[PDB]
């Protein structure tokens, strides 16, 4: 019934707001607080390992917030632990990527980082200009679409709950959860006249895989670098 779907929309959006890491209003407020050339040079002077270690810590914290989000979705804690881990492993980094658009300012093409906004040059020490440029382009595309907070909530909830992920054991429970979330999101998009917004989303699987790969690389080779 319509009331149940409205309540599911409310609950998903509430959980997302609870686990969104940074409130969108604070991001918009800090938009005016931009790194000075001295601070950008400071970040560019860091070693590749120092900068990658910081970025990987941030990505890990974001993955933890996405796990917290999943845990607050009705029915996800009913799935067996194996299915929970399969779903999180397969979708959490994509959800991090989606979330990152909230901290992107298309006007000046800067992103929030460690308290202030800075352009792409902040990451000169990462030596992965291709991946950095690609993730900035992805965030730019999502910002251009004016993806709202409720839309991010519902789309990420559906990114996580996917019954087609290889490894699932209880495919029917996951199917039912995904179907209820699809109903909720469809009703929301109809209310807002945003039905076609999903055909315009760009791909994100490759970027998320590369980010997870860098995180794993840093975990692995930590004995050959400083504490």
């Amino acid at each position: 019934s319509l009331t149940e779907i409205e309540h599911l929309v409310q609950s998903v959006c509430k959980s997302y707001r609870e686990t969104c890491q940074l409130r969108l209003e604070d991001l918009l407020r800090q938009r005016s607080n931009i790194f000075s050339r001295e601070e950008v040079t400071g970040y560019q002077r860091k070693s590749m390992w120092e900068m990658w270690e910081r970025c990987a810590h941030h990505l890990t914290e974001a993955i933890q917030y996405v796990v917290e989000f999943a845990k607050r979705l009705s029915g996800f804690m009913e799935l067996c632990q194996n299915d929970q881990i399969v779903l999180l492993k397969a979708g959490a980094m994509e959800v991090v990527l989606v979330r990152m658009c909230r901290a992107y300012n298309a006007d000046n093409r800067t992103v929030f980082f460690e308290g202030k906004y800075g352009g792409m040059e902040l990451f000169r020490a990462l030596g992965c200009s291709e991946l950095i440029s690609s993730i900035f382009d992805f965030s730019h595309s999502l910002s251009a679409l004016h993806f709202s907070e409720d839309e991010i909530a519902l789309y990420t909830a559906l990114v996580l709950i996917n019954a087609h992920r290889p490894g699932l054991q209880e495919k029917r429970k996951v199917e039912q959860l995904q179907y209820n979330l699809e109903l909720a999101f469809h009703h929301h998009l109809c209310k807002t006249h945003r039905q076609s917004i999903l055909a315009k989303l760009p791909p994100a699987g490759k970027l998320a895989s590369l980010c997870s790969q860098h995180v794993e690389r840093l975990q692995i080779f930590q004995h050959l670098h400083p504490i």
Partner: peptide, 14 residues
């Protein structure tokens, strides 16, 4: 999508 992410997830899940 790999073992390190799975470690993070297993830690944060329990």
């Amino acid at each position: 999508t790999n073992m390190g992410l799975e470690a993070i997830i297993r830690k944060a899940l329990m």
